[PDB]
Design a protein around this ligand. Structure first.
Ligand SMILES: Cc1cccc(O)c1
Ligand SMILES: Cc1cccc(O)c1
Ligand SMILES: Cc1cccc(O)c1
Ligand SMILES: Cc1cccc(O)c1
Ligand SMILES: Cc1cccc(O)c1
Ligand SMILES: Cc1cccc(O)c1
Ligand SMILES: [Cl-]
Ligand SMILES: [Cl-]
Ligand code: NA
Ligand code: NA
Ligand SMILES: [Zn+2]
Ligand SMILES: [Zn+2]
Lengths: 21, 28, 28, 21, 28, 21, 28, 21, 28, 21, 28, 21
């Protein structure tokens, strides 16, 4: 999930965009 | 875990901005 | 639209807190 | 939507819960 | 009132920052 | 009130110190 | 401590949201 | 303290109501 | 003006995110 | 400035990017 | 890096408030 | 920079002022 993906290692805007609808 | 909770608070804000009119799915 | 944008930012933070582990869809 | 529902008159926590998964 | 709600949110943040270890009351 | 004082014209940080303990 | 500072910031927000018209004290 | 209680394991909103007036 | 002040607070956060390692210039 | 540009009318990500270094 | 990112978010909000009309450069 | 200066030990408001324009 987003916490696993983005809270230990940093997420780019593209990676954040994954969670958009 | 509190560090994850604080992280998630920023993540929601980032999604809000990034996703714009598409909106987003927050699943913790 | 700016006022709506500002309000939404606060709404998604509120949803983050109220919804907790269940998460939420934000679909504007 | 939530914006039109909640951005003029304040939504209670209970009303906001309606948008949870 | 959503405007007061949004203003307050920022006020509490500001108070948290300026008040330091003293702390504050928010009792609108 | 802090709302009357500070939501209708900008309060400085200096002014806001008035509301500290 | 920056960790406590950051945690507190989120706590005050949460208190502002949950406490409503009652308000709150943050007096760490 | 609220810091001892809530910065080291997550406090629910219900728990945080304890710190309201 | 308070509406501008609240807007600016969100603008800073958006710049923070958008600009990444470039950073930004906030001039009000 | 950014307030004039982005607080009466809404700014896209591209428009926000203008203010990046 | 995530902790640094979270901290920076709060720093730029603080700078927004402390610096006021003068503004600031955030250059990480 | 400000991050390395201020993200472990808390920076006072005065220290943060050093980064204003
Ligand atoms: C923008 C952001 C916030 C929190 C964690 C991340 O990886 C990215
Ligand atoms: C908590 C919250 C934030 C923004 C709008 C609302 O109606 C309620
Ligand atoms: C810092 C701040 C927030 C909200 C209103 C104000 O006048 C000042
Ligand atoms: C809502 C919130 C913020 C910070 C710490 C917590 O345990 C809970
Ligand atoms: C992202 C954002 C915040 C505030 C105003 C804007 O136009 C855009
Ligand atoms: C006010 C503030 C926020 C984040 C880090 C700091 O040192 C100080
Ligand atoms: Cl944080
Ligand atoms: Cl706002
Ligand atoms: Na997606
Ligand atoms: Na630029
Ligand atoms: Zn934070
Ligand atoms: Zn706001």
């Amino acid at each position: 999930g987003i916490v696993e993906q983005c809270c230990t290692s940093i997420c780019s805007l593209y990676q954040l965009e994954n969670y958009c609808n | 875990x509190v560090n994850q909770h604080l992280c998630g608070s920023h993540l929601v804000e980032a999604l809000y901005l990034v996703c714009g009119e598409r909106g987003f799915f927050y699943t913790p």
